[PDB]
Write an enzyme that holds these catalytic residues in place. Sequence first.
Site, PDB file in Angstrom:
ATOM      1  N   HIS A   9      36.216   3.205  36.392  1.00  0.00           N
ATOM      2  CA  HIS A   9      36.644   4.535  35.896  1.00  0.00           C
ATOM      3  C   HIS A   9      36.734   5.528  37.045  1.00  0.00           C
ATOM      4  O   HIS A   9      36.261   6.671  36.998  1.00  0.00           O
ATOM      5  CB  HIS A   9      35.689   4.963  34.782  1.00  0.00           C
ATOM      6  CG  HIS A   9      35.905   4.144  33.571  1.00  0.00           C
ATOM      7  ND1 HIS A   9      37.078   4.277  32.853  1.00  0.00           N
ATOM      8  CD2 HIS A   9      35.212   3.119  33.020  1.00  0.00           C
ATOM      9  CE1 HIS A   9      37.056   3.412  31.842  1.00  0.00           C
ATOM     10  NE2 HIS A   9      35.974   2.660  31.971  1.00  0.00           N
ATOM     11  N   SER A  41      35.210   2.566  26.675  1.00  0.00           N
ATOM     12  CA  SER A  41      35.889   1.757  27.726  1.00  0.00           C
ATOM     13  C   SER A  41      36.483   0.461  27.067  1.00  0.00           C
ATOM     14  O   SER A  41      37.357   0.564  26.194  1.00  0.00           O
ATOM     15  CB  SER A  41      34.961   1.535  28.919  1.00  0.00           C
ATOM     16  OG  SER A  41      35.771   0.895  29.933  1.00  0.00           O
TER      17      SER A  41
END
Length: 384
Positions: free
Chosen positions: A261, A159
């Site tokens: 996400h 990420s």
Amino acid sequence: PDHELVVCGAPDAAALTGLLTRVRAAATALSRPELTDLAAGLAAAHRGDVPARFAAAVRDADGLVAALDRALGHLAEGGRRLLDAGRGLFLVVGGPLRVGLLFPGQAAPVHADRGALGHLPAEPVDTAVAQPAIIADSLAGIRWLDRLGARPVGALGHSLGELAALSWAGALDADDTLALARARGEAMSAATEAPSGMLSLRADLAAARELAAGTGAVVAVDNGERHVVVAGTRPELDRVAEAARHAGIEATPLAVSHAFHSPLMAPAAEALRRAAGRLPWRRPERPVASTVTGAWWADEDPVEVLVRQLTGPVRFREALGLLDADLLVEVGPGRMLSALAEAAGRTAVSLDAGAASAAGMAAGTAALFAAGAVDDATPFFAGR
Ligand SMILES: [Cl-]
């Protein structure tokens, strides 16, 4: 420092056995100061082309003697490779090995970690503060690798960590990367349209997709066969938690107030696109295994990739499988990704950049030296 780094080496296994035997005899009953002098001398004397290598991170002389006994026992049985990340002990004859880098993202705390003990809340991370804080510590770790001349095979970032991996690979400079992190944390801290969050499953991707099917929740983080996180609104997460209890899968609520996400991050991705399109991106010059695409980075538009990063899943299992490496070194604060990599069966240690304890910097640097990714451990003794 609270851990000392003890390195040495020799032309071959027989010579290394002789040297370690001698270092073991000399280490019995050394004070801390004496140990530091020995360790500083050994780092000065054992740098450059050092064929067969030993390195250990130790608390004291007895720890050093313990580590040497293990290395000697190994060599005596004809062993040529002992990599024990959790004890900071590394021995390699016939290296170098392939070393990959892991760049962490933000911590994923459990909502109410029991405790009673379960078998018988945590505050979410403030993302606008945390994202640039983590990237600054990762950029400090890249400066450490640059001071050492490290030669890893490639990197991946989880990420947020993909930004640091791109900076390491030369796609963006440190100052621009830190500024982009500030912008990204500010964008992603905005409230979602409705209350939302994340739920961790002790299960694989297909099991997670089966539990989520028809619920509205979606896969957010694919960390491996033993750990998949889903995201959505609170009603969506409740559907999955019910399905998981019926299937006998352990579902753990996380301390986050955002479905990171997932599609609920689309407004944040629009804001990120503005910040990112203003930057002087360059082609990466070192291998990066993307956790957006699950593939090696190859001529991608970074604005497009970092924007769809926010709405799509983190492909950590796939990116970690691409990175062919005998040893992984985490470059960032904490040990989030080394824990993840260990759960996938890989060998990993964290430098733990920016930490109070020198535990991680000693262990991580020991791993880089023994694996042959750096030739000189003297920077650990500089400027105390
Ligand atoms: Cl997938």
